[PDB]
């Protein structure tokens, strides 16, 4: 005989399974199926449902997905269930351990409004069926809508050494690690085994940075699409002032990156050795008042006013293959490293265009060398004296 | 007490759920499972089955998938359930709205015979596990087998203005939009957010065009494989006369495109700014009687007879990276724009080969400039006077 004390549960008096408690009847079956993992469902050629379910979705966490409800806590929980990295770690060993976890794929099929910077932990693959392209109304992806706009929508994880030798997660929007920081231990990257395939990211107007791709060595992207082609008034368009900011990401590849921006499209700083940006399509949403934008992250030597599609400095030497750059005051601003002019400016066959032939310069090169191959597409501005 | 009138249903008497009707018993459970969406099946770490099923398949619509039965209506129903765009629309706002719908991924794992031109609507991602490569018998993908062979197997959507001011979906095999048409309002593309991975397309012998990539700006492809290596005799091989016809597709990227053709491999016309074709493998199925093939879509300046692997004109300037071209009379025929010779012919390291060294010309350049990088692979024809 089996004695069951008052206040017992099947889980606390032997568990459910052979030799212990066995579910019997329809009510039990319903609950067993409702709270299971799919192991009760057989599949072909063999095995069970749980054997083949490997992707995660925000819907598993009850995200509304209408771009209205604040789905922040659900997105964080989904991410946490994959790799939950504490914001303060004791030492280098602890932070590095988080890059050694199981990687999981996430599928985003609706629109998720969020209001705090999302930090992607290592071991995360994100996918959406197709990438946005000058899309008028984003229907799938992420919509950053914070109170504090002096922030980034998405950011990779980089830990900064504290006075006591401990490491805290970086949460400063303007911060980016340098090759020096990584070398001398002041910064430790916690960004690896991260893959993006078609992520659409829109932001409330005025958000400072779309994506902070910091410390993402070896991390890859395909079809990353930033910003919404909301309408003619860029002042109210759902796109960030700065699309992407990247540093310490050697060996990182961005394939067919799409960026709609207001102030700066993409910025690459410091160590990005061997990184490539192929077939990028980076455009300001029209060039109305573009000449009045003030670059946010730029080398000291660049003091001109005007929006910049691609900015690179401090020794960064990303390879730009066949980029398409539209409606920019400055297509490219590139400065070599201050010390020795290191950092080759490399652009192969840029497709440069601007409505009404409005432009200041295509290649604003500072203290540097370059190899550029033109493809018969381009122009110089309307000012007969200063544009070239 | 609850009174239920004769002829009632749970729906007509309060509905199902808390405080209303609750299903009970095995018979109810079986029907609930059969007619539900998987919401009764819990999955890990939390949530239910319906939360992670996002991919569509023709089997959901009971397609036979044997390459024999006509699966046309079922393929069309699947595409329609994703984005049902009317063949006739009121105005530009109307046609443009259909590019703002949720995108859905489709997985094709069997072989589907169809008999009418399939029109892919915006917001569709097509996937097949692997791509064909000179395969003799196509086991997965689409098989176009129409009564009227003077048609296309697959086409993107482009709307043409009518005299009354309304727009109708183009169904003309020869039509292709130009920059003018787009600027005039005479044509409005309805092809955005389209992604193809490993699609295998085979067609009945005599079919004019394999794929009409018209207006596919920003649309992408990887492993798109056209034509079957049926047998030695090309007159009965299951491949189209013209593999791919493309226009108004600026920023589109075709990665590892594979085309087995009879008359022309790929044709690029008009605006294709910034578009790229990487690692394409284009080949006629043997050069037998190739010199007799008459190009269908070509510039006025090209009057020679012979099959052409790649044809480009009217200002199109697609970047061809490492293409592999085989068994063609003419590897590339390229014409600069009529008015000003615009449109650079760019080919980097083409791998050109042909059986028995049969060939007329590799680069047939008309009113144009070009930048070509040879990789030590090539040849010139057997005619000691005319071949170069």
Contacts from B64-70 at CB under 8 Å and sequence distance 24+?
Answer: B65/B109, B65/B110, B65/B111, B65/B112, B66/B110, B66/B111, B66/B113, B67/B111, B67/B112, B67/B113, B67/B138, B67/B143, B68/B113, B69/B113, B70/B113, B70/B114, B70/B115
Contact between B334 and B368 under an 8 Å Cβ cutoff? The reply is yes
d(CA A35, CA A314): 54
Q: Give the sign of the dihedral formed by CA A126, CA A128, CA A130, CA A135.
A: negative
Identify whether the C-beta of residue B121 lies closer than 8 Å to the C-beta of residue B157: yes
CB A370 within 8 A of CB A317: no
DSSP SS3 for A151: coil
CB atoms near residue A78 (< 10 Å): 25
Residues of B in contact with A376 (CB under 8 A): 317, 342-344, 369
Largest CA distance in chain B: 102
Please, are residues A244 and A259 in contact by the beta-carbon 8 Å criterion?
yes
DSSP 8-state class, residue A357 = G
Q: Which of B310, B253, B248, B302 is nearest to B277 (CA)?
A: B253
A26, A140, A324: residue with CB nearest B103: A140
DSSP A234: G
Q: Which of B29, B195, B218 sits opposite A281 (nearest CB)?
A: B218
Q: Which residue reads 């269908």 in tokens?
A: B296
**Nearest-CA residue of chain B relative to A59?**
B51
Three-state DSSP state, A99? helix
Q: Which domain holds residue A166?
A: 55-388
| Helix, strand, coil percentages, rounded to 5, for chain A | 10, 30, 55
Per CB-CB distance under 8 Å, the chain A contacts of B102 are 109-110, 139-140
Length of chain B: 388
Closest among A283, A212, A203, A265 to A239, alpha carbons compared: A203
What does the H/E/C string look like for chain B? CCCCCCCCCCHHHCCECCCCECCCCHHHHHHHHHHCCCCCCECCCCCEHHHCCCCECHHHHCCCCEEEEECHHHHHHHHHHHCCCCCEECCHHHHHHCCCCCCEEEECCCEEEECCCEEECCCEEEECCCCCCCCCCCCCEEEECCCCCCCEEEEECEEEECCCCCEEECCCCCCCCCHHHHHHCCEEECCCCEEEECCEEEECCCCCEEEEEECCCCCEEECCEECCCCCCCHHHCCCCCEEEEEECCCCCEEECCEEEECCEEEEEECCCCCCEEECCEEEECCCCCHHHCCCCCCCCCCCCCCCEEEEEECCCCCEEECCEEECCCEEEEEECCCCCCCCCEEEECCEEECHHHCCCEEEEEECCCEEEECCCCCCCCCCCCCCC
Which among A276, A216, A277, A219 has a CA at the least distance from the CA of A248?
A216
All residues of chain B having their beta carbon less than 8 Å from the beta carbon of residue A349 are 319, 346
Comparing CA positions, the residue from A264, A261, A259, A257 lying closest to residue A285 is A261
B202 Cβ partners below 8 Å, 6+ apart?
A: B138, B141, B142, B143, B144, B226, B227, B228, B238, B239
- Please state, in angstroms and rounded to a whole number, the distance separating the CA atoms of residues A325 and A330: 10
Q: Strand A158-161 relative to strand A187-189: parallel, antiparallel, unpaired?
A: antiparallel
Residue A93 three-state SS = helix
Task: Report d(CA B72, CA B76) in Å as an integer.
Answer: 6
Experimental method for this entry?
X-ray
Count of alpha carbons within 13 angstroms of residue A258, beta-carbon side: 31
Contact B319 A131 (CB under 8 A): no
**Residues A348, A335: Cα–Cα separation, whole Å:** 18
Q: What are the two backbone dihedrals, phi and then psi, of residue B75, each rounded to the nearest 5 degrees?
A: -65, -40
Partner-chain contact B346 A137, CB within 8 Å: no
Nearest to A33 among B42, B125, B273 (CB): B42
Q: How many residue pairs from chains A and B have C-beta atoms closer than 8 A?
A: 144
- Max CA-CA distance within chain A? 100
Resolution to one decimal, Å: 1.8
**Nearest-by-Cβ selection for B47 from A61, A131, A198:** A61
What's the order of all strands across the beta sheet hosting A264-269?
A118-120, A152-156, A209-214, A242-247, A264-269, A308-313, A330-335, A361-366
CA-nearest of A260, A193, A183 to A225 is A260
CB contact under 8 A, A36 and B42: yes
Q: What are the tokens at B213?
A: 């990539």
- Residue of A129, A221, A230 best to disrupt the B interface, most CBs of B under 10 A: A129
Is B342 within 8 Å of A140 when comparing Cβ atoms? no
* CA-based nearest residue in chain B for residue A66: B102
User: Two tokens at B170?
Assistant: 């183009």
In degrees and rounded to multiples of 5, residue B365 shows phi and psi of -105, 120
Q: Do B218 and A139 touch (CB under 8 A)?
A: no
Helix axes B26-35, A26-34, angle to 10 degrees: 30
CB atoms within 10 A of CB A387: 16
CA distances from A374 to A63, A339, A350, A360, A371 (A): 47, 29, 7, 18, 10
Give the closest of B46, B195, B219 to A60, CB-based: B46
Using CA atoms, how far apart are residues B43 and B233, in angstroms rounded to an integer? Answer: 53
Residue B245: name the closest of B329, B168, B164, B175 by CA. B175
Tokens 């596919």 sit at which residue? Answer: B216
Q: Return d(Cα B28, Cα B22) in angstroms, integer.
A: 10
Closest chain A residue to the Cα of B125, Cα to Cα = A129
The whole-angstrom separation of Cα A192 and Cα A272 is 14
Q: How far is CA B79 from the centre of its chain?
A: 14
With a CB cutoff of 8 Å and minimum separation 6, the contacts of A122 are A83, A85, A98, A99, A101, A103, A157, A190, A191, A192, A193, A194
- Closest-CA residue in chain B for A39? B43
Task: Give A324's contacts in chain B (Cβ within 8 Å).
Answer: 250-251, 273-274
Q: Which string of b and e fits A193-220 if b means at least 16 CB within 10 Å?
A: bbbbbbbbbbbbbebbbbbbbbbbbbbb
User: Looking up tokens 């409606």, which residue turns up?
Assistant: A327
Tokens of B360: 């007329």
B319–A349 C-beta distance less than 8 A: yes
B300 Cβ contact list (under 8 Å, min separation 6): none
Is A104 exposed, middle or buried (CB count within 10 Å of its CB: 0-12, 13-18, 19+)?
middle
Tokens representing residue B311 in the block: 């044809």
Residue of A nearest to B341 (CA): A376
Contact assignment for B47 to A29 by CB distance below 8 Å: no
CATH number of the domain where residue A332 is located: 2.160.20.10
Of A26, A129, A353, the CB nearest to B125: A129
């Amino acid at each position: 005989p089996k004695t069951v004390a008052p206040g017992s549960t099947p889980a606390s008096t032997g568990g459910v399974g052979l030799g212990a408690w066995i579910s019997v009847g329809d009510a039990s079956l319903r609950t067993q199926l409702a709270n299971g993992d799919g192991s009760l469902i057989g599949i072909h050629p063999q095995g069970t449902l749980n054997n083949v379910l490997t992707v995660r979705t925000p819907e598993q966490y009850n995200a509304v997905g209408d771009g209205i409800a604040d789905d922040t806590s659900k997105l964080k929980e989904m991410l946490s269930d994959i790799n939950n990295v504490p914001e303060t770690l004791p030492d280098a060993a602890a932070v590095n351990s988080y890059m050694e976890q199981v990687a999981v794929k996430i599928d985003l099929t609706k629109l998720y409004r969020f209001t705090e910077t999302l930090y992607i932990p290592p071991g995360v693959s994100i996918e959406i069926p197709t990438s946005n392209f000058f899309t008028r109304e984003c229907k799938q992806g992420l919509f950053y809508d914070p109170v504090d706009k002096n922030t980034a929508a998405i950011s990779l994880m980089v830990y900064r050494k504290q006075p006591d030798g401990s490491y805290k997660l970086n949460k400063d929007v303007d911060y980016y690690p340098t090759g020096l920081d990584i070398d001398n231990g002041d910064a430790i990257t916690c960004a690896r085994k991260i893959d993006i395939n078609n992520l659409n990211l829109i932001t409330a107007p005025g958000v400072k940075v779309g994506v902070k791709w910091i410390g993402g060595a070896g991390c890859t992207t395909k079809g990353l699409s930033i910003g919404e082609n909301t309408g003619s008034d860029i002042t109210t368009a759902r796109l960030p002032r700065v699309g992407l900011l990247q540093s310490a990401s050697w060996g990182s590849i961005h394939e067919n990156l799409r960026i709609l921006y207001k102030t700066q499209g993409a910025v690459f700083i410091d160590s990005n050795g061997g990184a490539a940006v192929n077939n990028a399509y980076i455009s300001r949403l029209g060039n109305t008042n573009g000449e009045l934008e003030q670059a946010v992250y730029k080398p000291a030597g660049f003091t001109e006013v005007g929006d910049v599609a691609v900015t690179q400095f401090a020794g960064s030497e990303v390879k730009f293959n066949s980029p398409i750059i539209e409606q920019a005051s400055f297509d490219f601003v590139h400065a070599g490293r201050d010390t020795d002019s290191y950092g080759l400016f490399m652009v192969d066959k840029p497709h440069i265009e601007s409505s009404g032939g409005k432009k200041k310069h295509s290649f604003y090169l500072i203290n540097t060398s370059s190899n550029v191959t033109l493809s018969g597409v381009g122009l110089s501005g309307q000012d007969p004296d200063l544009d070239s």
